[PDB]
């Protein structure tokens, strides 16, 4: 679930970057560092829309690095518990359902999956199908799911979905 | 505080001079661009000294008043004793 908020970040600049394009170097460092990272509080950082303010660069005593606090507006992807966001399943296997919500990778175990869906490897793509074959989920197919929880592992977030609720799944 | 109504010594203190010189020398030793034209100067301390004499060190001295306020003085805005 994407969001647009204001974040805070601190950049340490080497003295080699002093001179012309100093503020440009600060902006480039901010883009390189902040974009692509994910934090538990704010979720994945999609991109930065605008950089609000670069604070006064405080020269740290010793080690000569200048510290520039940066205020900026960035797009942040943040799944929440119980939220239904349309997703795309990337992989399907017996262990569970592997789905993707933009930058968010979601795993859906079969325990929460309704029993109408069964695993049939005999299909050309290894996927899940029902006996009536009305409901078929394969690669890159868009399906809806609700996030039951969120967990972060090694600065990377991983969520778990579920298909318990009605009017959810294939559209 | 703003540039106007600064109530502090217009003179750079010896402590400010020492710390500015050391910081600028460290910056020069870490490949910072030199604001002044150096004539065969390889010692970062001496280059920082000649920048101080040239009013070229790109450092703002933030003077904290005991009530929590501060005044930002550029090195060029201060008059050096030497």
């Amino acid at each position: 679930m994407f969001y647009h908020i204001s974040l805070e970040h601190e950049i340490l600049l080497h003295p080699r970057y002093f001179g012309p394009n100093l503020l440009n170097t600060v902006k480039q460092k901010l883009f390189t560092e902040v974009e692509g990272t994910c934090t538990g509080k704010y979720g994945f950082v999609i991109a930065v829309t605008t950089i609000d303010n670069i604070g006064a660069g405080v020269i740290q005593p010793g080690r000569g690095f200048v510290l520039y606090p940066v205020k900026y507006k960035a797009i942040v992807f943040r799944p929440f518990k119980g939220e239904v966001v349309d997703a795309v399943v990337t992989q399907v296997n017996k262990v569970g359902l592997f789905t993707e919500i933009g930058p968010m990778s979601c795993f859906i175990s079969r325990h929460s999956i309704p029993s109408e869906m069964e695993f049939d490897p005999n299909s050309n793509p290894p996927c899940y199908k029902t006996m009536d074959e009305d409901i078929v989920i394969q690669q890159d197919d868009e399906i809806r799911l609700k996030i039951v929880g969120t967990r972060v592992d090694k600065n990377d977030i991983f969520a778990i979905g579920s298909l318990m609720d009605d009017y959810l799944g294939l559209v | 505080q703003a540039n106007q109504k600064r109530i502090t010594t217009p003179y750079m203190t010896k402590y400010e001079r020492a710390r500015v010189l050391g910081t600028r020398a460290l910056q020069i030793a870490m490949c910072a661009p030199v604001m002044v034209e150096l004539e065969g100067e390889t010692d970062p301390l001496l280059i920082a000294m000649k920048e101080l004499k040239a009013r070229k060190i790109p450092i703002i001295i933030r003077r904290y008043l005991p009530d929590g306020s501060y005044e930002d003085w550029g090195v060029d805005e201060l008059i050096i004793t030497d």
Partner: peptide
């Protein structure tokens, strides 16, 4: 104390006059 009672800031405008960058 002295050399510790104040704080140093980098002036970005004044950096826009540097040589070997």
């Amino acid at each position: 104390a002295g050399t510790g009672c104040f704080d140093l800031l980098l002036d970005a405008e004044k950096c826009k006059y540097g040589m070997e960058i």
